[PDB]
Symmetry: D2
């Protein structure tokens, strides 16, 4: 998948993520309220009490709410994205550390944390562990991005050297490899702009472009994580600033679109389709969650703030996998 | 912009296109009814009479309705797209031809034609002229694609040598250069697949890809016309066979999304921002014309087989330039 | 392979080409003298008589000398290169044409022609036939480039529609597809420059390139014909104006080096290894033909304006397939 | 520049390097014999006594022989290549370390070291220093590759974290960025082979390639260090094994050629040409040095073994910047 944060021009931070998977059963939008318990591991019993309510896209098939992204009531936003062959986990916690499940990292940070630093500290009392949840069958190689209300982003990744933190990132993350590497890849591609190369001659012949779009030459178009990072970064940089929160979601979906993967164009070596099952955006300041799906391109939205925050069970919706065409006449 | 037709499994032809421009003049959905009247030229009063009623996206700022694409009541779909530096027009009609404004051809084909050969034969009595319009300020360099209910597809292209007809096209079209050139560019990319590269060794070091989608390696990703064509064909090829009309409209919007241009990422020589104004799709069997827009990713649909098809007046629907977000709880 | 002509500042035209093949049959430098005799066809005994003597690389395994490229005593340079899937030949000559073996045209142009229009006009009396030879086993799909002492350049291309002449070419040619197609592909790469991209900021992070040569971003690097053409033209464009013949021969070999294929990096459908057998350059004003080879990066030169130009017999020079390393001290 | 080692099939290791610069005055091939002194710094006086004789391309304008590449008599081969914006140097040595000049690293390792491990050890009694030699005007951002007779390669690079060593590399190095990054870039490009993609159809149309060469699609062609690494790596991998030492030099020059830079096609922001001024190859087993230049494509060779190794002054040659065309007739 691919993610990014942007900064509205009326002091408002937004974060969006594409989920790319090989077939998505289930997954609703869950507001999880205060004082629900979120477990830490699955085969053992500790379950931290969340100070904060948050909301996002997740599962509900194991025993604590699993969230892939979300905003909590204090303006911190987050995602776990795949991260194949670079994710490393422990068997048992370290010294003065106790253990956590990759799939649980988000719920737990979003229920407890507010600043982006709060997340770096929280995550040195954690060692990630090699536990296979039943909804997949194994521990998804993951890495996490996060973004507080101020718009400062961070990437946390579980390498084999140990947990790697990157402060003050450019607010973009996709998938493997490490964020360090994508950030230096960016340089190879600085020539990719919105501006036309200027006309040339080859002897007597005059050479001018086929039409508009040529400043972009070099930018790869495949759906490889390295390219996906490249396009999301590069169209974040040049895309026009969003003046308001609605415009933010719109941009965020226009940029993600360049990396949105149709059914069938990417196969695995087993032979299943890898496609964009949904794509969402969240706002720090209003604590809104907006989302879109493969089978429907109408953004649905929940407001976390206008709900019973305090509050016996989780609140649920519930995917409309059907194209919501407005008929202007019958 | 960029286009293509696909065919579903319930025997249904569908054609979609994005429109890329530096600013929107007022456009709308326009239903043109039988016997309305469409000029050939802006400076002349000859007004040929449309046999058929149709529906598409168009302008209304000039004497007759101008359609960028759409579908008449006999299930013929088409569009005009930009075709810069290649498009050539006349000063006067060749002997035994009526002259025509290039912005008027879709209207005129869509009001009087049913099959693809109908359009081929129709443009023998025609000569594209160098006529301006008050909408843009000049005769825009265009070429045309068309797609009848059977699924066949063509490209009419006004070149320096004359009007060039390409028959049994793959049903994808972009902008310049000419259809044969793009059709031969496809060759240089046949190793763009949905499949993964095999693993290799470089000495004792093992190499396997970053995650996925490496079979696509070499597909360009910019928004030049020539890149768009590639994306649009290769992703047309591999995307899943659509099964119904609606899931057909989705596939089209997904395939087109790969070539949807956000504001600011493409600038002009005068630094105008070139972006996808709207995307539309239409169907031959239902005669339904769908569309989203830059600020509204919600699809609106218009049925044409439900209207006063012999109406005296145009039937039009204004743009909803407002992002139409559903509230799942009170927001 | 890949070719091009350049012009120096002491008013000298030079043409170089690489030859890419899956194995070398015996080839050599061949000086063909005036009045030698060159067949049109292998199965026929008509033997037209060469006005001019020339020199180039060729075979000797068939009844007449076969030249892949070279330069006659009137300073006309040329080559035949592969032209797969596009090249079309006859079964019989069109009315009022003598038939010819495609492998024989360079010989026949080089023995009887002086300027580029001479060659254009000459191939109106000609029809490429489908005639095999015992060297390769079949009529190879080819096209031809030519370059006279004035610097002008042309591409003769045997298409399905017929023989296609492109005049005032940029003087670069590769393999397929057709010259117009490559000439229009150049457009999609005009932002391949020797200049650095400007520095940018992405938020607060500063970006500047890895070292150098980033203006080249987007130039493909594979050994498809279409890539080679690009490399060869853009590096023809920017490389430094050569000042003399010899430094002219170097530039050519440098520009060609970018498209020189090492053994094993390109395989065939039957898995034959396709590699650059040799590179040659020749000059119009000196009538000197230069060449290195895969195993000998040392250039050997043959002067033609020093021989028995009316000799009864061929004059030939065997390949030195031995890397010719200088010993600066006793090695 | 760009470099690589290959392994002959008769138990013989060879290493070649392209030198890319913005104008090359001077530079001969220098055999430096045993018991010559090689300084360590330029403004201060320590000068280590070399156990071994070696030979390569270098300068002779400062006060100790500067070598860019070479082989010593014990079969170790080496190069310094540029390394812009990633090279970091100290002002003063560390603890138990004393100081060295980037330009001197090669002479000194090649005069003293035999195994590739010998080089890792030697280089933890060294801290590189910020001293501006007169032939350039400043300390060239450098990084070093090395290769012993056994064919095991290593890359040493001076990062800002400190000196970075990579063991058992793939035997390829160009320029920035770090070797770690190029090695993981390699994966993005595994699809680049010698084999044709197989034919496809688009509806009724048949699609087959323009001709031979299409397995290579994706490989970039620019002269950027990242691409240059990519081509040198990828054509090293697929190029046919060299059966003997002569064939080794030939391959090594056929592979380097793909990354050999013509005059004029690369400019700097000041506006000077950046071109390949020479390109050389060396053998572990025979201790031969072979070289080629921009203006001449005939390989000249020195044999280190057939010289006075022991031995008052340096031995010199001396560039023939003139195309050595054999005339087969006058
Ligand atoms: C005056 C313009 C800014 S608008 C007109 C025209 N159209 C567009 O920009 C619309 O999109 C394109 C789509 C494909 C190729 C070229 C352009 C074009 O080019 N134009 C510009 C130009 O020529 O500078
Ligand atoms: C089990 C799987 C079907 S899913 C897992 C992995 N990931 C995905 O499909 C998710 O999508 C990604 C897309 C790009 C980069 C990383 C991940 C992959 O490859 N996998 C497959 C595999 O080959 O085992
Ligand atoms: C001083 C210089 C002319 S040389 C220095 C640097 N390097 C080179 O020209 C050498 O060539 C390289 C080529 C590729 C990567 C790294 C180096 C560069 O850029 N430079 C120039 C600069 O811009 O200051
Ligand atoms: C029989 C062959 C291996 S040799 C013949 C022919 N030529 C080459 O491989 C020479 O190089 C080329 C140069 C440009 C385009 C195509 C080929 C070709 O293709 N051939 C091969 C084929 O068609 O498989």
């Amino acid at each position: 998948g691919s993610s990014l944060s942007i900064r509205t021009t009326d002091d408002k931070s937004l974060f969006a993520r594409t989920m790319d998977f090989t077939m998505e059963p289930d997954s609703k939008v869950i507001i999880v309220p205060r004082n629900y318990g979120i477990r830490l591991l699955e085969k053992e019993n500790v379950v931290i009490n969340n100070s904060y309510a948050f909301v996002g896209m997740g599962s509900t098939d194991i025993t604590s709410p699993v969230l892939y992204d979300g905003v909590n009531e204090k303006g911190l936003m987050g995602a776990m994205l795949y991260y194949a062959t670079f994710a490393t986990y422990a068997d048992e916690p370290k010294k003065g550390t106790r253990g956590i499940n990759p799939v649980y990292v988000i719920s737990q940070v979003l229920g407890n944390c507010v600043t982006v630093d709060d997340v770096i500290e929280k995550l040195t009392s954690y060692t990630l562990l090699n536990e296979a949840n039943i909804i997949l069958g194994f521990a998804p190689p993951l890495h996490y991005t996060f973004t507080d209300a101020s718009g400062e982003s961070i990437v946390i990744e579980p390498d084999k050297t140990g947990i790697t933190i990157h402060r003050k990132t450019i607010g973009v993350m996709t998938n493997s490899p490490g964020y360090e590497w994508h950030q230096t890849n960016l340089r190879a591609y600085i020539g990719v702009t919105p501006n036309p190369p200027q006309d040339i001659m080859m002897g007597d012949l005059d050479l001018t472009p086929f039409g508009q779009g040529a400043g972009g030459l070099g930018l790869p178009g495949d759906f490889t994580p390295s390219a996906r990072f490249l396009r999301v970064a590069y169209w974040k940089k040049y895309t026009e600033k969003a003046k308001n929160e609605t415009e933010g979601v719109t941009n965020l979906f226009h940029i993600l679109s360049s990396v949105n993967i149709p059914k069938g164009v990417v196969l695995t070596n087993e032979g299943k389709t890898d496609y964009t099952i949904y794509t969402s955006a969240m706002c720090a300041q209003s604590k809104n969650y907006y989302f879109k799906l493969y089978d429907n391109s109408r953004i649905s939205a929940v407001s976390l703030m206008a709900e019973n925050l305090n509050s016996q069970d989780l609140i649920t919706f519930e995917w409309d996998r059907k194209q919501d065409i407005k008929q202007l006449n019958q």
